[PDB]
Write a protein that binds this ligand. Structure first.
Ligand SMILES: O=C(O)CCC(=O)C(=O)O
Ligand SMILES: O=C(O)CCC(=O)C(=O)O
Ligand code: NA
Ligand code: NA
Ligand SMILES: [Zn+2]
Ligand SMILES: [Zn+2]
Lengths: 398, 400
C-alpha cells in the first residue's frame, strides 16, 4: 500500500568501459614477495639460511613472479644466502634490494640475481639551471650503476624513499630522468605509512603519464591503508606490488600477501585462483609464523580463526538476508571446507574438531588425543583463546 | 658532477589553495557510532552478559565516542533488559539501537529509552510504480508510519539498506531520496558483504551527498582489507558518521576497527583526535573486549599490537636510507606509550616482559615482576612463546 510521500525515481540519462579502465592492472600484475627482505625488518625475524631456502621454495611453488632478498652487502651471511637462493633453480625471478652504489651492484650481479631493486638517495640527483632551462640530473656515479647493471644483462628498478612526503617537482622529475636513461621499473614507496588511497591513485596515474616503463609500489600499514593503496595503485596502472607474508616488516609491516590475494580474488576469481596455489596459503603463513614466533591473528584475512564464521542465533537476525548470502570468499577456493556457523562457544576438543574439519585435516583417533591432552595442559596455565586452537593445529596438514 | 642524461624538470603551471570538494570533507569533523555492543555481538566468540555490556558502555562513554549502538531490544528479553539498563546509566554519549522497520520493534525501542533508532529497511518495503506517467519510488505506508511514530516520540531516526554496493543504483538512490523527503536524521550505507573498494565508496557517497540533505552513516566489513580505507574515503566524500567496533569484532572478520580508524584520523589531524578521544585509554579498552571474547591482540594490531612501535636495529635497518626514527607517523606518547622499541636481538622471558612493560608505562613492583617471570616460564613449558604471549601475560596490568 502507498500514499503521496514518494518521489520521482532518479534514473541516469549505452554503457561500456571508461578510458581509465584500460590502464588498470587489477587482473594482470605481478607480486614481488618481500618476506625475505622487508620481512627481515620484522621485530622478531631471525631467518637462517635453511629457513630462507624453505620460504623461497614455498613462495616459488605458491606462484609469485618475484622474490626480493636483503642486499648481499648487508653482511657476509647475506651475500652467501643470496648466492644459495639464486642456485636453487626457482621459476620465479630473484631480486635483491640495494643502495645506489657501484660496489653493491657488482656484488649483486656476482651472486646471480635476476635484478636489482635500487633505492636512490636525495644526494644522487640535483636540479640546476642549464642554458636557461630548469634541469634535473642523476649524478654521474649514480648513472654508472644503471648502465653497468644493464650491461651485465640484469633487470633494474629505481625507487625513492618516502615518496608521499617528497616535493612532487623533485620526485616526478627524477622518475622522468631515470626513464630517459632507461630502466625496467620505477618504484613508489610509502615508507612512513601515511598515504591515502585517492592520493595513491592520483600519484600513480600521473606517474603512469610521466614514464614509459613499469611501476612498482611499496606500502606500509601503520594506518590501515596498505591493502587499499595496493588496490588503487593497481587501478591506476601499477604493474608490480610488494607484499610480505602476514605483512611482516618494519613497525606493523606492509601489504600482506594473503590480504592482497583476498582483495584481488573478489575482483577476478579465475585470474587469481589459476595463477596462485591458494590452498597453500595456510601452510605458507604457518611457516613464517613459526619462524618469527607469532600467532596467526584471530581476524587474519582468509586464514584467521574467524574469517569464515557466521553467527548463528539471536544475533544473526541483525542481517536481513540469510547469512550465507554474504560469502564473498569461497572457502573451497582456499582449501577450506565451509563457513562455520557458531551458536554456542566450543570448549576444548570440540573447538579443535570444528576448526580441523574446516581446515581439511583428516585427523587420527591418536592425533585427536595428543591434541586434546595438549589443549588441557595449555588451559591449565591460563584461559584459552580462539588463537590457541589454530596454534595447537599448526603442525598438521591437509 | 653531471652529463647530458638529465631532462626538463616537470613543474606545474603558474596560486594553490583548497578545491571545492575539500569543503565537503568530514575528515576532522565526524562522529563515531561504536557498535561493539551490536555488530560485535555477531563476533564468533562474543557472549556478553549485562555486567560486561555495562562495563564496555561505561568505558566507551569515557573514551569519547558520541554514539554507542546496541542490539535490537526485540532480539530477546535479555536484549530488552540490557538496553533499558544501559539507557539508565546516564552516559554522555547517545544511545542507539539497531532495528528492523516494524512498528512493534520501534515501540519497544522507544519504551527502553534509546536516543535514536538505526533502522534497516527491507527490499519489500518500497516500490517502483508509474503514477500519472512519471517513474515513481514509494516507501510503503506501513514502513512510513514507523518513521513518523519515532519522530513523533522525539527520537532520532536513521534508515539503511543492507548490501548497498550490490544493489541497483536506480533503486538505492531513489529510496534514500524518498526517505529524505519524509525526513530523517540520517541515512546509512552498508557494505555488508566486504566487497566495496575505496574509489567506489568515494564515488557513491559524494553522489549520495548530492541526493539527500541529512547526515550520512557508513558501515564497512573488512573481508578484503578495505574497511579502514572505505571509512576514510567515505569521510572525504561527506559521510558524517562511521560505525566501528573495538578490534573490528563483528560478523566474519568484522568491520572498521575503532583503534585503526583513530590511528588513520590522528595522522590526518592530530589535534582534533587527541583532544576529542582519550587515546591513552585504548589499550585498556581493547583488553576489556579481548578478555570477554577470549582473543589475543594481534602482534600487528594498529597502535596497540606488540610490533606497532618497533624499529629493527642492526644490518636490516640499513635497508631504509634515513635513520629509522624519521618514520614515526604515530607518536607513542600520544597513545600512552613511552617510545619506539629498537630491536636488535630477540628478547626472551623476563627481558621481553621488562621491555614491553616499560613501553606500556606499567610501573611494575618487584613482586609483580616475579609473578610474571614465573607465569612466563610456566607458559614456555607448554610450547614455544609467541611474541603475543608478552602482551597476554601483561593484560591484567595498568599504567599508574
Ligand atoms: O625500496 C623500496 O622501494 C622500499 C623500501 C622500503 O621498505 C620502504 O620504503 O619502506
Ligand atoms: O544497519 C546497518 O547499516 C548495518 C548492518 C550490518 O551490520 C551490515 O550490513 O553488515
Ligand atoms: Na606514459
Ligand atoms: Na545535497
Ligand atoms: Zn618498507
Ligand atoms: Zn555489519
Amino acid at each position: 500500500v502507498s500514499e503521496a510521500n514518494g518521489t520521482e525515481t532518479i534514473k541516469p540519462p549505452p554503457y561500456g568501459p571508461n578510458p581509465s579502465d584500460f590502464l588498470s592492472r587489477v587482473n594482470n600484475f605481478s607480486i614481488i614477495e618481500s618476506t625475505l627482505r622487508e620481512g627481515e625488518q620484522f621485530a622478531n625475524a631471525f631467518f637462517d639460511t635453511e629457513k630462507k631456502i624453505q620460504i623461497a621454495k614455498a613462495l616459488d611453488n605458491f606462484g609469485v613472479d618475484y622474490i626480493e632478498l636483503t642486499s648481499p652487502v648487508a653482511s657476509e651471511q647475506s651475500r652467501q644466502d643470496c648466492e644459495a637462493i639464486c642456485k636453487l633453480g626457482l621459476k620465479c625471478k630473484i631480486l635483491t634490494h640495494i643502495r645506489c652504489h657501484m660496489d653493491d651492484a657488482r656484488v649483486a650481479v656476482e651472486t646471480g640475481v635476476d635484478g636489482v631493486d635500487v633505492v636512490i638517495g636525495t644526494s644522487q640527483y640535483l636540479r640546476k639551471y642549464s642554458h636557461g632551462k630548469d634541469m634535473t640530473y642523476i649524478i654521474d656515479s649514480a648513472t654508472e650503476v644503471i648502465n653497468f647493471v644493464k650491461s651485465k644483462g640484469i633487470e633494474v628498478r629505481f625507487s625513492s624513499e618516502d615518496s608521499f612526503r617528497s616535493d612532487l617537482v623533485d620526485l616526478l622529475s627524477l622518475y622522468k630522468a631515470v626513464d630517459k636513461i632507461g630502466v625496467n621499473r620505477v618504484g613508489i614507496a610509502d615508507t612512513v605509512g601515511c598515504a591515502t588511497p585517492r592520493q595513491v591513485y592520483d600519484l600513480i596515474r600521473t606517474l603512469r603519464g610521466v614514464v614509459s616503463c613499469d611501476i612498482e609500489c611499496h606500502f606500509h600499514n601503520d594506518t590501515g591503508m596498505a591493502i587499499a593503496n595496493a588496490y588503487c595503485a593497481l587501478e591506476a596502472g601499477a604493474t608490480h606490488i610488494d607484499t610480505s607474508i602476514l605483512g611482516i616488516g618494519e613497525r606493523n609491516g606492509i601489504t600482506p600477501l594473503g590480504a592482497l590475494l583476498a582483495r584481488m580474488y573478489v575482483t577476478d576469481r579465475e585470474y587469481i585462483t589459476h595463477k596462485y596455489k591458494l590452498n597453500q596459503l595456510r601452510e605458507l603463513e604457518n611457516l613464517v609464523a613459526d619462524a618469527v614466533e607469532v600467532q596467526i591473528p584471530f581476524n587474519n584475512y582468509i586464514t584467521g580463526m574467524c574469517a569464515f564464521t557466521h553467527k548463528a542465533g539471536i544475533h544473526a537476525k541483525a542481517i536481513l538476508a540469510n547469512p550465507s548470502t554474504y560469502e564473498i570468499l569461497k572457502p573451497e577456493d582456499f582449501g577450506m571446507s565451509r563457513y562455520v556457523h557458531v551458536g554456542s562457544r566450543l570448549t576444548g576438543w570440540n573447538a579443535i574438531k570444528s576448526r580441523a574439519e574446516q581446515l581439511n585435516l583428516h585427523l587420527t583417533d591418536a592425533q585427536a588425543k595428543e591434541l586434546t591432552v595438549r589443549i588441557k595442559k595449555l588451559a591449565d596455565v591460563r584461559t584459552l583463546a580462539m588463537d590457541d586452537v589454530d596454534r595447537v593445529l599448526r603442525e598438521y596438514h591437509a
